[PDB]
């Protein structure tokens, strides 16, 4: 396997400088004419290029950053790095490292990284808040829709289960939104009328960057 | 810089149907070497994005006979004959001609399936969100189809548009329809203000709303 690597930071303040560092197997940065770079793409958004490193220290940038940006290597060790300094929240973005080779099984991105999850916020870590949602009653039907709402926390991400995961059919669980700069996400789970209240439906909420975790039953009005 | 223009910006397509999608550049995508970089990535729900097409015409491996690419100069096409449902994701065009290196906005190649009313379910703010100070009004607008369903919320009669934060689902890959969330945020002030809270979908080219309402001076 003909690998990419990125790691670094994760999260940012405004004003900081954004750097990652690109590990490579399965192929060197010594070889005429190999090529690694940076694409970016933020949240529900495309995919922006960002500038590109040769063997031969060649660099290419894209020039709506090239006073931010610096790409470099380091040739004994098979690593690349990128520099942005002066950030904001705009930087937010998974930051992939991709091979492009010159001159002739090259000249595409055939191989990606996984890619890292850079957040750019000046908010300060939050546990969040959840709120059960029991329906009106009465409201009304063969089908009741039960929800949780998961409020104020920073950063991404967040897991939410129903009944421990012994309810996984029925259930949507929605992208976060940020109402800044914190995230809020829902969740809506739906049992027969049979099921629910003459049975106890609770919403498991962790968050790993504050090693909360949480449970919320949902109790009827 | 040269711009990629994509067309269209949403596909949904049948399986077993034909696919097209146009990428027109901005400027020749001819490399002064005579080539052309011309690439197609596809890219799925939480993964990279994965090379289709290279050099505008070939398939990078693994890719099946049923993906081509044609195209010269800045009128560029890929097809896919008779989709599957592994095909369905977001679909790239790329020029590695002319720095800086360019991506189209993007293809959504998703399922067609008949339309369906979204099962609407209002929730007013719990007890405890009101004793830490806030208000949140949560409407699931769930497993409708196609996916620009168009919510509004009205306050006492009023329609009101201000502090309202939609979700939107991925496509179910099970029932091929898609969910929402709509989340109406107030004061507990301006929240303890009003009575009647109505969240009512539209879909489409309709005529007649979904409504699901409460009243507090019932709650
Ligand atoms: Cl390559």
């Known amino acids: 396997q003909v690998t990419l690597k990125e790691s670094g930071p994760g999260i940012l303040k405004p004003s900081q400088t954004l750097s990652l560092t690109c590990s490579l197997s399965?192929?060197?940065?010594?070889?005429?004419?190999?090529?690694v770079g940076w694409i970016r793409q933020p949240s529900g958004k495309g995919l922006e290029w960002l500038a590109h490193?040769?063997?031969?220290?060649?660099?290419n940038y894209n020039p709506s950053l090239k006073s931010q940006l610096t790409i470099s290597k380091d040739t004994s060790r098979n690593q690349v790095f990128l520099k942005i300094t002066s950030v904001d929240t705009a930087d937010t973005a998974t930051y992939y490292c991709v091979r492009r080779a010159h001159n002739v099984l090259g000249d595409w991105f055939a191989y990606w990284g996984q890619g890292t999850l850079v957040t750019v916020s000046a908010a300060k870590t939050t546990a969040p808040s959840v709120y059960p949602l029991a329906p009106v009653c009465g409201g009304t039907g063969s089908s009741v829709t039960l929800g949780c709402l998961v409020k104020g926390y920073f950063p991404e991400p967040v897991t939410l289960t129903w009944n421990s995961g012994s309810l996984s059919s029925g259930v949507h669980t929605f992208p976060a939104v940020l109402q800044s700069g914190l995230y809020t996400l829902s969740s809506s789970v739906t049992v027969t009328s049979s099921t629910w209240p003459s049975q106890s439906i609770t919403c498991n909420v962790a968050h790993p960057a504050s090693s909360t975790k949480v449970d919320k039953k949902i109790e009827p009005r | 810089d040269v711009l990629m223009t994509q067309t269209p910006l949403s596909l949904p397509v049948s399986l077993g149907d034909q696919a097209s999608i146009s990428c027109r550049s901005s400027?020749?995508?001819?490399?002064?070497?005579?080539?052309?970089?011309l690439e197609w990535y596809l890219q799925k729900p939480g993964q990279s994005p994965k090379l289709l097409i290279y050099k505008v015409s070939n398939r990078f491996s693994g890719v099946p006979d049923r993906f081509s690419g044609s195209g010269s100069g800045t009128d560029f096409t890929l097809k896919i004959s008779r989709v599957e449902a592994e095909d369905l994701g977001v679909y790239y065009c790329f020029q590695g001609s002319h720095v800086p290196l360019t991506f189209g906005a993007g293809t959504k190649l998703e399922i067609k399936r008949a339309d369906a009313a979204p099962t609407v379910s209002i929730f007013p703010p719990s007890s405890e969100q009101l004793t830490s100070g806030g208000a949140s009004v949560v409407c699931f607008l769930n497993n409708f189809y196609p996916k620009d369903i168009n919510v509004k919320w009205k306050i006492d009669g009023s329609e009101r548009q201000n502090g309202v934060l939609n979700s939107w689902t991925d496509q179910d890959s099970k029932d091929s329809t898609y969910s929402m969330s709509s989340t109406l945020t107030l004061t507990k002030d301006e929240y303890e203000r009003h009575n009647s809270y109505t969240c009512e979908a539209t879909h489409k080219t309709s005529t007649s709303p979904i409504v699901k309402s409460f009243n507090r001076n019932e709650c």
């Open positions: 400027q020749s995508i001819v490399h002064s070497n005579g080539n052309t970089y």
């Open positions: 490193i040769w063997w031969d220290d060649d660099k």
């Open positions: 399965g192929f060197s940065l010594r070889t005429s004419g190999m090529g």
